[PDB]
Amino acid sequence: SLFELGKMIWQETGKNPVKNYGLYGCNCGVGGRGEPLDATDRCCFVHKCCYKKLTDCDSKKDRYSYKWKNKAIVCGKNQPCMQEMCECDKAFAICLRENLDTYNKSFRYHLKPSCKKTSEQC
Numbered sequence: 001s002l003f004e005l006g007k008m009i010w011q012e013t014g015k016n017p018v019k020n021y022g023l024y025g026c027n028c029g030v031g032g033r034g035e036p037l038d039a040t041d042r043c044c045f046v047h048k049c050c051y052k053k054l055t056d057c058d059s060k061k062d063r064y065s066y067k068w069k070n071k072a073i074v075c076g077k078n079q080p081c082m083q084e085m086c087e088c089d090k091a092f093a094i095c096l097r098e099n100l101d102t103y104n105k106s107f108r109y110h111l112k113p114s115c116k117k118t119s120e121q122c
Contacts (some may be wrong), residue, residue, distance in 0.1 A: 001063045004086070008093035011068050013100060021096070025107045026115035034115030039102050043095035049122035050088035057081035059088070066090070 009017040018029075025041030026034035027048060036042040051059045057079075064086045065076030073093060075086035 001059070001061055004064055004066060005089045005092070007068075008066070008073055008089055009096055011073070012093040012097040020103075020108065023109050023112070025110050026112060031112045033118065034112070035118040035120075037107055037110075038104060039099040040096060040104070041107070043092055043099060045118075045120075046095065047088060047092035050091070051085070052122055054081055054085055054088075057085060059085050 006017040009015070009021065013020075015021075021040075021044070022029040025037040025044065027036055027041050027044035029044075033045055033048050036045045062082060062085065064078045064082035066086050067074045067076060073090045075083055075090060078086060
Protein backbone atom coordinates (compact mmCIF):
# COMPACT_ATOMS: atom_id res chain seq x y z
CA SER A 1 0.00 0.00 0.00
CA LEU A 2 0.90 3.69 -0.14
CA PHE A 3 2.10 3.42 3.47
CA GLU A 4 4.72 0.77 2.68
CA LEU A 5 5.81 2.63 -0.46
CA GLY A 6 6.23 5.91 1.39
CA LYS A 7 8.32 4.29 4.11
CA MET A 8 10.58 2.58 1.56
CA ILE A 9 11.27 5.82 -0.30
CA TRP A 10 12.00 7.61 2.96
CA GLN A 11 14.30 4.80 4.09
CA GLU A 12 16.25 4.73 0.82
CA THR A 13 16.41 8.45 0.02
CA GLY A 14 15.90 10.08 3.41
CA LYS A 15 13.40 12.48 1.85
CA ASN A 16 9.71 12.94 2.53
CA PRO A 17 7.97 10.96 -0.25
CA VAL A 18 4.90 13.19 -0.56
CA LYS A 19 6.75 16.50 -0.79
CA ASN A 20 9.51 15.26 -3.08
CA TYR A 21 7.66 12.77 -5.29
CA GLY A 22 3.96 13.48 -4.91
CA LEU A 23 3.82 15.77 -7.95
CA TYR A 24 7.28 15.36 -9.50
CA GLY A 25 7.63 15.46 -13.27
CA CYS A 26 5.18 13.74 -15.59
CA ASN A 27 5.04 10.33 -13.86
CA CYS A 28 5.58 10.70 -10.11
CA GLY A 29 2.65 10.75 -7.72
CA VAL A 30 -0.79 11.96 -8.76
CA GLY A 31 -1.98 11.25 -12.29
CA GLY A 32 -1.05 8.60 -14.82
CA ARG A 33 1.98 8.34 -17.07
CA GLY A 34 3.57 10.57 -19.68
CA GLU A 35 6.91 11.17 -21.39
CA PRO A 36 9.50 11.15 -18.55
CA LEU A 37 11.40 14.40 -18.05
CA ASP A 38 14.47 12.84 -16.43
CA ALA A 39 15.90 9.77 -14.66
CA THR A 40 13.84 10.27 -11.51
CA ASP A 41 10.73 10.66 -13.65
CA ARG A 42 11.67 7.47 -15.51
CA CYS A 43 11.74 5.58 -12.19
CA CYS A 44 8.12 6.55 -11.68
CA PHE A 45 7.20 5.58 -15.23
CA VAL A 46 8.63 2.09 -14.73
CA HIS A 47 6.97 1.83 -11.32
CA LYS A 48 3.49 2.59 -12.64
CA CYS A 49 4.11 0.13 -15.48
CA CYS A 50 5.01 -2.47 -12.85
CA TYR A 51 1.63 -2.05 -11.15
CA LYS A 52 -0.06 -3.25 -14.36
CA LYS A 53 0.67 -6.91 -13.57
CA LEU A 54 -1.38 -6.64 -10.37
CA THR A 55 -4.75 -8.22 -11.12
CA ASP A 56 -5.94 -9.42 -7.70
CA CYS A 57 -4.95 -6.68 -5.26
CA ASP A 58 -5.04 -2.94 -4.65
CA SER A 59 -1.62 -1.27 -4.83
CA LYS A 60 -3.19 1.69 -3.03
CA LYS A 61 -4.91 0.16 0.00
CA ASP A 62 -3.61 -3.41 0.32
CA ARG A 63 -0.95 -3.83 3.00
CA TYR A 64 2.03 -6.18 2.68
CA SER A 65 4.94 -7.18 4.89
CA TYR A 66 8.54 -6.15 4.32
CA LYS A 67 11.65 -5.47 6.39
CA TRP A 68 14.26 -2.72 6.32
CA LYS A 69 17.38 -4.41 7.67
CA ASN A 70 21.08 -3.89 7.01
CA LYS A 71 20.19 -1.02 4.67
CA ALA A 72 18.26 -3.42 2.44
CA ILE A 73 14.59 -3.90 1.62
CA VAL A 74 13.33 -7.47 1.93
CA CYS A 75 9.78 -8.39 0.94
CA GLY A 76 8.25 -10.71 3.55
CA LYS A 77 5.88 -13.67 3.51
CA ASN A 78 3.07 -12.26 1.38
CA GLN A 79 0.43 -13.63 -0.96
CA PRO A 80 1.51 -13.63 -4.65
CA CYS A 81 -0.15 -10.34 -5.64
CA MET A 82 1.08 -8.56 -2.50
CA GLN A 83 4.61 -9.83 -3.08
CA GLU A 84 4.57 -8.57 -6.67
CA MET A 85 3.42 -5.20 -5.34
CA CYS A 86 6.21 -5.20 -2.76
CA GLU A 87 8.84 -5.99 -5.39
CA CYS A 88 7.52 -3.21 -7.65
CA ASP A 89 7.83 -0.74 -4.78
CA LYS A 90 11.25 -2.04 -3.75
CA ALA A 91 12.77 -1.54 -7.21
CA PHE A 92 11.19 1.91 -7.36
CA ALA A 93 12.64 3.04 -4.03
CA ILE A 94 16.11 1.91 -5.10
CA CYS A 95 15.70 3.64 -8.47
CA LEU A 96 14.93 6.95 -6.76
CA ARG A 97 18.00 6.70 -4.52
CA GLU A 98 20.21 5.90 -7.51
CA ASN A 99 19.06 9.11 -9.20
CA LEU A 100 19.23 11.59 -6.33
CA ASP A 101 22.22 13.17 -8.06
CA THR A 102 19.97 14.57 -10.81
CA TYR A 103 16.88 15.36 -8.75
CA ASN A 104 15.48 18.61 -10.15
CA LYS A 105 13.87 21.06 -7.71
CA SER A 106 12.10 22.76 -10.63
CA PHE A 107 10.34 19.47 -11.40
CA ARG A 108 9.15 18.92 -7.81
CA TYR A 109 5.78 20.59 -8.36
CA HIS A 110 5.23 20.01 -12.06
CA LEU A 111 2.40 21.13 -14.34
CA LYS A 112 1.31 17.60 -15.26
CA PRO A 113 -1.37 18.77 -17.73
CA SER A 114 1.53 20.06 -19.87
CA CYS A 115 2.98 16.55 -20.14
CA LYS A 116 2.97 14.77 -23.50
CA LYS A 117 1.73 11.25 -24.22
CA THR A 118 4.56 8.77 -24.76
CA SER A 119 4.83 6.11 -27.46
CA GLU A 120 6.99 3.91 -25.23
CA GLN A 121 5.25 0.74 -24.04
CA CYS A 122 5.42 -0.79 -20.55
